[PDB]
Amino acid sequence: TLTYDDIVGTGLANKCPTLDDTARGAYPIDSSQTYRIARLCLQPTTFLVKEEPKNKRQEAEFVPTKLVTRETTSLDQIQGELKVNSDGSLTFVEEDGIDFQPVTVQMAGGERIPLLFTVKNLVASTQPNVTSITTSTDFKGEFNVPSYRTANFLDPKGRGLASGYDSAIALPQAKEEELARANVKRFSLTKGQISLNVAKVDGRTGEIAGTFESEQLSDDDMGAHEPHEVKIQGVFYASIEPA
Amino acid sequence: AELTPEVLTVPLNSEGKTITLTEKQYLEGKRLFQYACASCHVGGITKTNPSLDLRTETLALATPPRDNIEGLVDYMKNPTTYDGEQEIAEVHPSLRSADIFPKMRNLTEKDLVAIAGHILVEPKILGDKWGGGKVYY
Amino acid sequence: GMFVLPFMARLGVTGSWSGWSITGETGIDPGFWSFEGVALAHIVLSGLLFLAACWH
Amino acid sequence: ELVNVVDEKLGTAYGEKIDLNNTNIAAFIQYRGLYPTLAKLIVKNAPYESVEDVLNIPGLTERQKQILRENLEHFTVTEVETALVEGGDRYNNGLYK
Amino acid sequence: EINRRVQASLASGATLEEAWSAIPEKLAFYDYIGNNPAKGGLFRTGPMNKGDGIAQ
Ligand code: CLA
Ligand code: HEM
Ligand SMILES: CC1=C(/C=C/C(C)=C/C=C/C(C)=C/C=C/C=C(C)/C=C/C=C(C)/C=C/C2=C(C)CCCC2(C)C)C(C)(C)CCC1
Ligand SMILES: CCCCCCCS[C@@H]1O[C@H](CO)[C@@H](O)[C@H](O)[C@H]1O
Ligand SMILES: CCCCCCCS[C@@H]1O[C@H](CO)[C@@H](O)[C@H](O)[C@H]1O
Ligand SMILES: CCCCCCCS[C@@H]1O[C@H](CO)[C@@H](O)[C@H](O)[C@H]1O
Ligand SMILES: CCCCCCCS[C@@H]1O[C@H](CO)[C@@H](O)[C@H](O)[C@H]1O
Ligand SMILES: [Ca+2]
Ligand SMILES: [Cl-]
């Protein structure tokens, strides 16, 4: 039973809870009972970025990156409805939580890739006929990926979308057209996909843990440049509860 | 320009009756407002919630109306949210909560009236500066 | 138009401290003897030879 | 082709009235009786297909309904603009005085 | 001066288009801040054309 003073500064605060190796049980689902995920935690351990080949006909791979924004990456205190569907599948509907983190990773050679690592508005479902959550249960779903910067964000020349200059004021008589993409800010909103593979189950406490892989676009600097494809891998913890 | 009896004449109630404050009353009002209110309301704004200011138009659209002496005295006794829906004495200085807001303890009825008068007169002097915030400094 | 880079590669210096390699790999640790390390080494050597020149 | 969506939205009813679907909550202070109770309910139960749908918020007192009816003329609805509603910006859009 | 001329034109019965079309381009070009000598920079070197361009 660790206190804040036990944990502060250690890096444990950015880690999701684990389950003992004994946690290989089954958590029964009463189809007449409503359920909630009281806490969903996602701890990323690897950020992969898809390289962008030159011939545009090559098989592009996801390459490793170096995290440079430190232990600030985990999503936690996420809660939401856990619906029991007609076909016996379960569906988690994310309601709220600390469900995003800006992350910057660096590619070989130095290119930095910011992204909003997130499961905002996650809807994720299991296979049909889940009478018990077990080590064979998986969740698959989609989430929203809003702009990495929100609407008030001003670039270094003070241009922005919901605020800021709408032109390059330091170039008073330059031609506008060439600068359009930099002058007119755009707010991206795209989709991401995620799988959760349950590896451990405490059927008594309703706790589950496992691994996840998510895929989503990175920052596009409010429309100034193309986003990169990102694959995030890590571990997750969830506490299931009768609602 | 001068601080005339006309400047110092403000609405007493919602029914169109006015009251004319003395210069001593005006000074007492500024003093008491600085004493018990300016820490949050300096210049007619509200530091812990800038959405609500002390402009007369704002007070007039409040519920119940707060753009007169009776409204402001009542507010200093039993403050409400802007729609009048919640009583907020527990988080806003008032006579009702003088136990947890101790500077309210030595405030008399006369004092509340002076403060009210200050809040109503000051925009007649300062115009848009009152409730304007830094834009109008 | 690279001239000394191939001579470094020829004898086994193929990686950068920044993580890339000339064979196109990623996430490699070249150790100190990256291209940058080799360069640094030569600069320092230069400095020391300069001082020795003064003394002699 | 490139468009600032907020400037564009200023040329719609959003630039004329309180957009029940987009406008920051502080705007409800403009009119008697809307803030904070009704404003919170309205933003909470957004978006609305039409303005009068605001009347269908569950739990509304009769007084509340009357006040809403009194203020429908100051309301509008337009398409939800992502840029205006992300980042919790409807509760706090970075503007104070 | 431009406004004076345009007004003289209109008063003589010209249309708005006619009145403004009677204004010499040279005159209009004087009424432009890019030709104001107090709009420059110490290290912004060269002809005015190098800034806002060659007026057409
Ligand atoms: C009376 C002096 C004078 C003036 C007013 C002009 C004016 C002009 N010249 Mg001309 N020119 C001159 C003499 C002058 N010229 C001389 C002597 C030469 C021979 C080099 C030229 C050769 C020349 C060329 C080749 C060109 C011009 C051009 C021009 C036009 C652009 C000016 C510009 O960009 O300057 C920029 C001015 C500066 C960047 C200021 C420099 C300040 C110095 C470096 C400060 C020195 C600091 C000092 C070291 C401090 C010491 C401290 C110590 C005491 C402790 C402008 C109409 C250009 C043009 O448009 O032609 C059609 C052009 O191409 N000129
Ligand atoms: C000092 C005794 C004092 C007075 C007087 C005062 C007045 C006042 C009024 C009239 C309002 C309503 C504004 C409106 O437009 O309707 C109001 C609102 C708030 N105030 Fe206040 N206030 C006084 C003191 C203080 C102090 C010391 C603080 C800061 C801690 C403070 C803050 C606020 C806040 C917040 C509000 C808004 C409350 C809400 O509606 O939710 N006031 N004040
Ligand atoms: C082993 C090894 C190596 C190599 C090494 C080397 C190559 C070294 C060199 C070294 C050197 C190369 C050194 C030098 C030194 C020098 C010096 C030490 C100098 C000194 C000087 C002086 C002292 C001077 C002084 C002066 C002056 C400056 C001025 C005038 C006066 C007088 C004279 C006083 C390596 C890396 C590969 C790695 C492995 C191991
Ligand atoms: C003598 C040491 C000089 C300092 C070395 C500079 C850092 S190393 C430098 O890093 C860049 C960004 O990651 C890379 O793009 C580049 O390839 C690499 O050489
Ligand atoms: C005073 C309301 C009736 C009792 C409700 C529970 C007491 S709550 C009470 O609220 C007062 C402000 O009204 C404060 O003065 C006091 O400190 C606070 O504890
Ligand atoms: C003057 C700068 C000195 C910096 C030395 C950094 C050593 S770094 C160190 O070096 C070893 C030998 O290259 C490697 O095998 C090892 O993997 C690496 O971590
Ligand atoms: C004169 C001070 C220059 C010191 C520079 C020491 C670089 S040291 C170098 O750094 C790399 C990461 O950047 C590592 O991959 C490698 O193991 C390590 O040797
Ligand atoms: Ca499994
Ligand atoms: Cl306002």
End-to-end span of chain D in angstroms?
Answer: 35 Å
Largest sheet of chain B: 2 strands, antiparallel
Query: What's the helix count of chain B?
Result: 5
Order of strands in the sheet with the most strands of chain B? 1-2
| Class based on secondary structure composition and strand pairing of chain D | mainly alpha
Count of the domains of chain B = 1
Strands of chain B, count: 2
In which range does the helix fraction of chain D lie? Answer: 25-40%
Counting copies of identical and different chains, the oligomeric state is part of a larger assembly
The small molecules bound here are:
chlorophyll A, protoporphyrin IX containing FE, beta-carotene, heptyl 1-thio-beta-D-glucopyranoside, calcium ion, chloride ion
Tell me, briefly, the overall form of chain B: globular
C-alpha end-to-end distance of chain B = 20 Å
| The named CATH superfamily of chain B | Cytochrome c-like domain
CATH superfamily of chain D: Photosystem II 12 kDa extrinsic protein
Into which percentage range does the β-strand content of chain D fall?
A: under 5%
Strand order of the largest sheet of chain D: 1-2
How many runs of DSSP E, i.e. beta strands of chain D? 2
Question: Which features characterize this protein?
Answer:
part of a larger assembly; 5 chains; B: 137 residues; mainly alpha; Cytochrome Bc1 Complex, Chain D, domain 2; two-stranded antiparallel sheet; C: 56 residues; 2 helices; elongated; binds chlorophyll A; binds protoporphyrin IX containing FE; binds beta-carotene; binds heptyl 1-thio-beta-D-glucopyranoside
Description of the structure:
The structure is cut from a larger assembly and holds one copy of chain A (243 residues), one copy of chain B (137 residues), two copies of chain C (56 residues) and one copy of chain D (97 residues). Chain B has a two-stranded antiparallel ribbon. Chain B has five helices and two strands. Chain B has helices at residues 23-36, 38-41, 56-61, 69-77, 109-126; strands at 9-11, 18-20. Chain B has one domain (1-137): Cytochrome Bc1 Complex, Chain D, domain 2. Chain B is mainly alpha-helical and 137 residues long. Helices cover 37% and strands 4% of the residues of chain B. Chain C is mainly α. Chain D starts with a helix and ends in a 12-residue tail after the last helix. Chain D has four helices and two strands, in the order αβααβα. Chains in contact: A-C, A-D, A-E, B-D. At the A-D interface, loops of A face α1 and α4 of D. The site of one heptyl 1-thio-beta-D-glucopyranoside has 6 residues of chain B, from loops. Chain B: Keywords: Electron transport, Heme, Iron, Membrane, Metal-binding, Photosynthesis, Photosystem II, Signal, Thylakoid, Transport. Chain B: Belongs to the cytochrome c family. PsbV subfamily. Chain B: This is Photosystem II extrinsic protein V. Chain B: It is found in: Cellular thylakoid membrane.
